[PDB]
Each structure stands twice: as C-alpha cells, then as structure tokens.
Amino acid sequence: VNSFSGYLKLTDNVYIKNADIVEEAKKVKPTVVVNAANVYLKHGGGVAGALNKATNNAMQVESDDYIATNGPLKVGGSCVLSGHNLAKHCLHVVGPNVNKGEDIQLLKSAYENFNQHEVLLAPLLSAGIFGADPIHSLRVCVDTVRTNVYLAVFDKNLYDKLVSSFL
Numbered sequence: 001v002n003s004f005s006g007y008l009k010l011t012d013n014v015y016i017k018n019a020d021i022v023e024e025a026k027k028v029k030p031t032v033v034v035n036a037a038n039v040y041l042k043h044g045g046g047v048a049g050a051l052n053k054a055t056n057n058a059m060q061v062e063s064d065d066y067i068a069t070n071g072p073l074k075v076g077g078s079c080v081l082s083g084h085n086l087a088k089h090c091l092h093v094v095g096p097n098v099n100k101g102e103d104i105q106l107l108k109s110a111y112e113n114f115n116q117h118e119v120l121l122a123p124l125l126s127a128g129i130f131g132a133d134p135i136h137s138l139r140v141c142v143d144t145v146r147t148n149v150y151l152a153v154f155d156k157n158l159y160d161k162l163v164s165s166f167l
C-alpha cells in the first residue's frame with residue numbers, strides 16, 4: 001500500500017492520472033520523482049522547468065554542479081539527484097527529443113532506468129515538448145517498466161485519449 005490516490009490501473013504495475021506532477025509530488029512526497037531531463041540538465045521548460053521552479057531553482061544549482069563534475073548525460077540515460085522539497089530523490093531521465101532529431105528507439109532505454117527503483121512518480125518520457133507520440137510513450141512504458149510507476153499526464157484531453165486508446 002502506498003499514498004498515491006485517484007489513479008487508473010492500466011496493468012499490474014502501471015497507473016495513470018490526469019495531474020500536475022509538481023502538485024502530485026508536493027502532496028505525495030514520493031521516494032522518487034522522475035524528471036523529463038535533457039543531457040545538460042538545463043531545466044528550462046516542460047516538466048523540468050516546472051519541477052525546477054517548484055524547488056526555487058535549487059534543482060538547477062545542484063544540476064549545474066553535477067554537469068561540471070561529470071559532463072552531460074547520454075540520451076537514454078539518467079542520474080539520481082536530490083528531490084529537494086518534492087521527493088526524496090529525483091531521477092533525471094533523458095528521453096529522445098524528436099525536435100532534435102534523436103532516435104525514438106532510445107525511448108525504451110530511457111524507460112529501463114525506471115526499473116532500478118521500486119516505485120516512481122513519473123511523466124510520459126519524450127512527450128510534450130520532446131515531440132514524441134504520447135500513445136507510443138505509454139506503450140513503451142507499459143512494455144518496459146516492471147517496477148511500480150504512477151504516471152501523471154498534465155493535459156486532460158490527452159489523458160482521456162491515452163485511456164480510451166489503451167490496449
């Protein structure tokens with residue numbers, strides 16, 4: 001039993017809700033919130049910009065130190081950093097950005113990072129401003145993640161389409 005509320009159950013381990021991941025994180029304070037990161041951990045817009053804003057830019061400050069030490073992430077890769085006021089940890093995961101010409105096949109590799117964590121609050125990787133088809137992202141999530149994932153879909157109209165089209 002966990003403290004996630006109001007989710008629709010898609011499979012044994014995947015759950016979905018129309019919700020603002022910032023507000024969801026602030027309420028649940030999950031062990032792991034997933035950020036839709038880029039390789040530079042520059043949290044300017046989309047989920048990343050919203051999460052970082054909610055941390056009063058502390059996420060960005062921490063991320064800049066991470067990059068200065070370690071260099072950029074790989075597309076498909078991840079790193080674990082602080083969750084600040086939102087979660088214990090933030091798993092920064094880089095899905096491919098279609099608007100940069102990145103290989104959509106890397107979306108599966110991106111979701112594989114979730115399997116290192118028993119329970120996560122997450123967005124649909126590569127959705128929104130990353131330019132991929134969210135129906136495809138949900139399918140890859142369901143077919144790749146084996147741990148317990150609670151998906152927040154910000155857009156209500158998109159949420160309804162993902163549910164109604166879910167196989």
Ligand SMILES: OC[C@H](C[C@H](O)c1ccccc1)Nc1ncnc2[nH]ccc12
Nearest residue numbers: 021046047050123124127128152154155
């Ligand atoms: O897949 C990324 C997802 C896209 C979003 O659902 C969308 C917005 C407009 C049109 C269609 C779809 N972004 C988020 N998901 C959850 N919480 C969030 N908080 C801030 C951003 C955000």
Ligand SMILES: [Cl-]
Nearest residue numbers: 046047128129
């Ligand atoms: Cl987005």
